[PDB]
Design a protein that fits this description.
This protein is of the alpha+beta class. The chain is built from 16 helices and 16 strands. Carries out a dual function: signal transduction and activation of transcription. Involved in IL4/interleukin-4- and IL3/interleukin-3-mediated signaling.
Length: 409
Amino acid sequence: AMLLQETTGELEAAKALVLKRIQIWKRQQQLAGNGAPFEESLAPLQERCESLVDIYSQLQQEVGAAGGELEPKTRASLTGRLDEVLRTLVTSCFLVEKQPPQVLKTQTKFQAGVRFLLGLRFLGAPAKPPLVRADMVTEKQAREINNTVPLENSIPGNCCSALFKNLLLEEKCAVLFSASFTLPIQLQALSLPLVVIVHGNQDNNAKATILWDNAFSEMDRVPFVVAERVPWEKMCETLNLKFMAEVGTNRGLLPEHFLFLAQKIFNDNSLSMEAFQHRSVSWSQFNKEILLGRGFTFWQWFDGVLDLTKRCLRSYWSDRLIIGFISKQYVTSLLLNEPDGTFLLRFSDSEIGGITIAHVIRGQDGSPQIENIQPFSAKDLSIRSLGDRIRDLAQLKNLYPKKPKDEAF
């Protein structure tokens, strides 16, 4: 037989590869929710999808107008496969270009955006634009106002998107976007989980559950399952990214900071980072269990640091003037033998989002002792700068190590 159906299998394989390129784009977009690079456009991806449709076009006219003329092998058993290649590709093109706010207040106006990749090839000028409906569904309904926007095209933009500029209203519920279409096939697009806050108490547990979803999700997800015992290396990586992103700095967390954050989260005084690198970290350990002796979970404390550092310590963290994540065992280790007045800047343990000035003083007996000045929260730092306050304290002379106070600040 003529049957060179290996070019159909080539299209079947190239379509499978394009489907992964889209899958990967959605994961980069999901990681970007927890402040991450990504910044990838759907424009080159759309070009790859156009090429698949172009290959499907040539392959469809070759089958039907055959030379060898074979029946159900080069007709029914061959057209059914090519039909699937278009059916699956078209459904894997109705995406969410701009995601809705995952931390959503149940009244504020939120913007949304969906993009169809094969719109410039399937929706011409005389063809009517399909009305897209954005109905909110829960985690159960995921497994199958102002929600009506027509899918329009663009000549000086080369796209077929649909922006929903106006929209008003542990519970992961996402917005389902859908539209009617005919070559009479249907299109659907599900967004990333959204927790709806009422703005009465606090959104702390919503930000923590979104952070855990976006970072610790699989590409082959069943909306909306998340692994609940991730390794510490991945959590450190995520915490480092969320730090640099929320704080707005390029100077990130380093191995020593991580060791402290591990000693706090596990309530373990171990010193080897080996006995911490490959270790399980549950969602309970992260935002359920209250820290020993404290009235808050680990995420509540880390979020306070992000709040404080972003708000008033943005400059000093970047300047590498704040150690921040250091155990009292290590502060004594360095500062204790340095000359009097040598100070250091670290984060308050007992108080949520505070910065204490640890410094070396002379004890009652004369031997060096470690003194910690009362911590400054963002409210005290709004009244007076950290550098201004550090200047007001005459006992403070040099920031560790051996670096004049007035020179550093």
